Structure formats: structure tokens, C-alpha cells
Amino acid sequence: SASQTVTIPCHHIRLGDILILQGRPCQVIRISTSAATGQHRYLGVDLFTKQLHEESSFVSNPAPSVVVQTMLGPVFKQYRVLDMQDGSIVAMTETGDVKQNLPVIDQSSLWNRLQKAFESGRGSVRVLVVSDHGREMAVDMKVVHGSR
């Protein structure tokens, strides 16, 4: 099943954001304007396959004088990190479900940043997880604030 999504106004999209392009979660690497339509065009790199995809914004008119250009972004899940072993991690969902071999994307030194944070406080460490058509991958990390 394809990733759950949220709607993002185009003004709020910047390079590096993750969007659904052609049904695939992609890192945005170029934002341009279509000369034929005037809409924003997004070029991105598939998080899983590393292929390039392109998609233009969707224009809508939800109310008088309201014109809206939006894109879809993935809903990210947040898992705890229980262990790190050879490029993948053991992660736990909010409900205790254990994922034994969760891959970590090779992007912006994520693995090294995760390893450094894991070794100085394991359970303050969370991974942000994208889930597309059955497959999951950690694509970012967070150190959970103590108050949480």
C-alpha cells in the first residue's frame, strides 16, 4: 500500500524536502516553473531506487478567490532505535512492534550521525521512517527532548 500523505502548499516547499513524485517518495533537487502552465515543477530523487522523477503542482480552487498549488508529502513515522548492526537498525514502533532489519538511507551521513547519537543516549534517539508499498526506511533522525 502506498504511503499515507499530507498536503503541502507549494510556497512551503524547499530544496531537500521529501515529496511524493509520480507516486514515489523523492528528495526534491530542483524546483522550476513550467512555461506552458506557469505551475511549479518538481524534480526529485527516489529515496529507494535513486531514480529521477518529475511532477507538477496540483492547482485547486476550493473557495471563491482561493487558488491553491499543493504537493503531497509522506507521513513520517517515528521509531525508537534498539540496536545498530551492519548498515541496518533494530527499531521499535510506538506500540512495541520490533523491526529487526530496518535499512538506513545513505544520505547526508545519516548512519554516522545516528551512530554518534546512539552511543551517547540510545532511547533519546528516534528515526523518521518513510513507508512506501510495504518497504520501510529510516531517512532522518531526532534526539527526543527529555521532557518527552
In 3D, which of 5, 2, 1 has the Cα closest to residue 70?
5
Q: Are residues 101 and 65 in the same domain?
A: no
Q: Are residues 3 and 70 in the same domain?
A: yes
- Residues 134 and 131: their CA atoms lie apart, in Å, by 7
Dihedrals phi, psi of 141, to nearest 5 degrees = -135, 160
Q: Which three cell numbers stand for residue 38?
A: 506557469
Residues 6+ apart with CB under 8 A from 66: none
Domain holding 122, by residue range, is: 75-146
In 3D, which of 51, 48, 69 has the Cα closest to residue 60?
69
Q: Which three cell numbers stand for residue 117?
A: 547519537
Q: What CA–CA distances, in Å, run from 100 to 33, 68, 83, 121, 143?
A: 43, 42, 9, 20, 21
Q: What CA–CA distances, in Å, run from 84 to 90, 105, 106, 111, 148?
A: 6, 13, 15, 9, 23
The number of folded domains in the chain is: 2
Q: Are residues 48 and 100 in the same domain?
A: no
Q: Which three cell numbers stand for residue 23?
A: 507516486
Resolved by: X-ray
For residues 41 and 34, the answer to whether their CB atoms sit within 8 Å is yes
In 3D, which of 82, 105, 77 has the Cα closest to residue 92?
82
Q: Identify the domain boundary among 74, 94, 114.
A: 74
Q: Identify the domain boundary among 20, 44, 74.
A: 74
Q: What is the CATH number of the domain that holds 35?
A: 2.30.30.30
In 3D, which of 54, 63, 8, 56 has the Cα closest to residue 29?
54
- The DSSP secondary structure of the chain, one letter per residue, reads -PPPEEEEEGGG--TT-EEEETTEEEEEEEEEE-TTT--EEEEEEETTT--EEEEE-EEEEEETTEEEEEEEEEPPEEEEEEEEETTEEEEE-TT--EEEEEEB--STTHHHHHHHHHHT-STTEEEEEEEETTEEEEEEEEE--TT-
Q: Which three cell numbers stand for residue 118?
A: 546512539
